[PDB]
């Protein structure tokens, strides 16, 4: 339940700033969108070796505070803070599994937390707020790493402010 901190030692803000999620294992990959299954438009969140540092994210809580604690339930989103598109969610979808995808809607309390893990942070997804969480990890397919629930095998990120 400590404050989430970026690579500069500053508290991660609530919505005001965008941040790159920088993998510590992958090194040459950044967040991007990819097609999943039969879909025309890319809606699955992936780590793409060709796209570094990748698309930046915003961390959003309805609480009226400008810092993010590891205990806060968060929405994570691509794009502008106020915009309702690019909001992350978890969708069961073959062939990835419990796939991280973007939608055009934003729920009040998001299902994600950011938790200290090893030498960085991991993303953890909660199917309901009362429950234990599921680490977000990577499913290697089509020369990219689909972000998906992979409990016990989290992807570890440092949080680098886009500036």
């Amino acid at each position: 339940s400590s404050v989430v901190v970026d690579t500069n030692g500053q508290p991660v803000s609530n919505g005001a700033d965008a941040y790159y999620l920088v993998p510590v294992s992958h090194g040459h990959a950044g967040l991007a969108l990819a097609k999943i299954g039969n879909e025309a438009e890319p809606r699955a969140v992936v780590l793409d070796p060709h796209h570094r540092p990748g698309l930046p994210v915003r961390f959003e809580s309805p609480l009226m505070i400008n810092i993010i604690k590891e205990s806060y339930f968060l929405n994570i989103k691509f794009g502008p803070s106020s915009s309702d598109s690019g909001v992350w969610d978890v969708i069961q979808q073959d062939p990835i599994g419990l796939a991280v995808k973007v939608t055009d809607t934003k729920s009040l309390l998001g299902p994600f937390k950011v938790e200290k893990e090893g030498e960085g942070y991991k993303i953890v997804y909660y199917p309901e707020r009362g429950q234990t969480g599921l680490d977000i990890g990577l499913v290697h397919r089509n020369d990219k790493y689909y972000l998906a629930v992979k409990d016990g095998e989290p992807c570890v990120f440092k949080i680098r402010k886009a500036t």
Partner: protein, 223 residues
């Protein structure tokens, strides 16, 4: 505060700032040694700044006092945001002056339509960010609990109330957390949460301090 006005130096003498190397929450001085804020503002080694108007100047009518005890409500529920109230005992009593005075606890809950004073140093924009130097103030009315539950279905507990305008344009915003909502001269609310800032049909939600007066008094009496 979105859609507000500059309070002035002496206007909100019960407002305090919670500090840990940076301002991160508001709070209310309820006597010379005790502060009320939001549970979600709990942090280790909080410093309370009293008598601040300009948050960016280090003037000398201000006081910086360490927290000695920071007591989150024992039933605070991080999943539901219920019981979002925290007591801070200051390591030393505040010296009272033009810019430092306590606000008292209510004798009863406030009714729909009562005009309240909400204050803080949070974001003043509903889209984007702008943080003020000086304390900002907003007058906004208490909404009936039925409208509050109608704006936020399935999320309003009995220990919360809404205040503001469903037309939008005026609201507390990020950085106001923990700050006071004062109605009829008594502390009725603590800035807690909301869907965005100053959005249509999305008023601010506040901790219902009237429900906590017994626990506050007991905790102060026992500490």
């Amino acid at each position: 505060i979105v859609g507000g006005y500059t309070c002035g130096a002496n206007t909100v003498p019960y407002q305090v700032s919670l500090n840990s190397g940076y301002h991160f929450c508001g709070g209310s001085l309820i006597n010379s040694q005790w502060v009320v804020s939001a549970a979600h503002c709990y942090k280790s080694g909080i410093q309370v700044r009293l008598g601040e108007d300009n948050i960016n100047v280090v003037e000398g009518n201000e006081q910086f006092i360490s927290a000695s005890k920071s007591i989150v409500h024992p039933s605070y529920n991080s999943n539901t945001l219920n019981n979002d109230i925290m007591l801070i005992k200051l390591k030393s009593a505040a010296s009272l002056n033009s810019r430092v005075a306590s606000i008292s606890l209510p004798t009863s809950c406030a009714s729909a339509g009562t005009q309240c004073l909400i204050s803080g140093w949070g974001n003043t924009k509903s889209s984007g960010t702008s943080y003020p130097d000086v304390l900002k103030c907003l007058k906004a009315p208490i909404l009936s609990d039925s409208s509050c539950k109608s704006a936020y279905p399935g999320q309003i507990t009995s220990n919360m109330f809404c205040a503001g305008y469903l037309e939008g344009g005026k609201d507390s915003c990020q950085g106001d957390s923990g700050g006071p909502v004062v109605c009829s001269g008594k502390l009725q609310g603590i800035v807690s949460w909301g869907s965005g800032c100053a959005q249509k049909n999305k008023p601010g939600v506040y901790t219902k301090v009237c429900n906590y007066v017994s626990w506050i008094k007991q905790t102060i009496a026992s500490n």
